[PDB]
Amino acid sequence: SNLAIYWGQGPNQLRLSHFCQETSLDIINIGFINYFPDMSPGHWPGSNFGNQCDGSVYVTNDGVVTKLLSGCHQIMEDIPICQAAGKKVLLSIGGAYPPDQSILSEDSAVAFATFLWGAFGPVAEGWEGPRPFGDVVVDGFDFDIEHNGGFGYATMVNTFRQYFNQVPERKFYLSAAPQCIIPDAQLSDAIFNAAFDFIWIQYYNTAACSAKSFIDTSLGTFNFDAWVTVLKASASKDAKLYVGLPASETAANQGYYLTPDEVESLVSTYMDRYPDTFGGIMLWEATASENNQIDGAPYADHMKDILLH
Numbered sequence: 424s425n426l427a428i429y430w431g432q433g434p435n436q437l438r439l440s441h442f443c444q445e446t447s448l449d450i451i452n453i454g455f456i457n458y459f460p461d462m463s464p465g466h467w468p469g470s471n472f473g474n475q476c477d478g479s480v481y482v483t484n485d486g487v488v489t490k491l492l493s494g495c496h497q498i499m500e501d502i503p504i505c506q507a508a509g510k511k512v513l514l515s516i517g518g519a520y521p522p523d524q525s526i527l528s529e530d531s532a533v534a535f536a537t538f539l540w541g542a543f544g545p546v547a548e549g550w551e552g553p554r555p556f557g558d559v560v561v562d563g564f565d566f567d568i569e570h571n572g573g574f575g576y577a578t579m580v581n582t583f584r585q586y587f588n589q590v591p592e593r594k595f596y597l598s599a600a601p602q603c604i605i606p607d608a609q610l611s612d613a614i615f616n617a618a619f620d621f622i623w624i625q626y627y628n629t630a631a632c633s634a635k636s637f638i639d640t641s642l643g644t645f646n647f648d649a650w651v652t653v654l655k656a657s658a659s660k661d662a663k664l665y666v667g668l669p670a671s672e673t674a675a676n677q678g679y680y681l682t683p684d685e686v687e688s689l690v691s692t693y694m695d696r697y698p699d700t701f702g703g704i705m706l707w708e709a710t711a712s713e714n715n716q717i718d719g720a721p722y723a724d725h726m727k728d729i730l731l732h
């Protein structure tokens with residue numbers, strides 16, 4: 424079972440090459456493309472990577488100043504190291520801030536997909552768009568849509584997967600990151616109507632189905648079961664489900680963090696019930712895990728031992 428984590432939005436983060444050297448980590452999601460074309464200057468998507476990148480943004484063939492970052496030099500340098508180390512690197516779409524971003528048509532969702540594929544996918548001839556990370560090719564795209572409904576996303580997923588299928592030699596990945604409440608307002612249409620390789624339900628910040636509601640069953644009702652049942656119905660039936668967790672008490676709202684012993688008792692129960700769908704743990708996020716050093720190692724290292732034990 425696999426350990427996925429988020430990097431990109433950590434206060435004072437170290438550079439991604441620190442995390443590339445963390446052997447426990449099998450997947451790293453880079454957040455975020457957070458400005459969508461429909462409300463962003465030029466219809467270009469924009470990006471934000473916390474402290475990373477020199478602050479420069481592309482301007483278009485029209486002189487339009489965009490929201491995309493053009494000098495992300497450490498990330499370009501660092502994504503190949505991660506991949507040279509066995510790790511899959513997915514570029515994440517959305518995130519928490521700002522909360523006023525969405526997709527308005529099926530056309531803009533095909534264009535959004537196509538722009539990301541040209542931009543961060545394989546190097547391609549006729550592509551006359553940006554290459555924010557140079558000749559690096561990501562392994563996939565993560566959908567962390569946490570605002571404004573689910574319109575457009577199954578289309579973006581199938582459009583992506585349409586593109587994947589032309590590169591038969593290489594294997595590319597689609598994941599999503601719902602919150603616990605079923606149905607997820609952002610991603611249930613996506614999950615149902617398209618094939619996600621991985622899905623990591625965020626089990627923090629919502630009381631009625633939080634991971635901590637497994638340890639304290641008075642807080643809400645941990646619902647991984649209901650989720651295996653919808654997954655079975657869906658176009659993502661072969662998706663691997665992940666229990667999404669905060670890597671430190673200071674990573675999500677108070678009381679969502681579980682101690683390793685609490686995690687283990689979650690994991691050994693749901694790895695055994697659904698050995699065929701259970702996939703692993705996902706952490707929010709990389710920096711909080713760094714700073715949560717338990718006996719000379721970070722939180723993620725202790726998660727991986729749990730999964731192997």
Ligand SMILES: CNC(=O)NC(=N)Nc1ccccc1
Nearest residue numbers: 429518519567569600625707
């Ligand atoms: C994988 N996505 C996240 O972990 N999202 C997340 N933590 N969003 C967020 C929502 C409200 C406040 C802070 C962060």
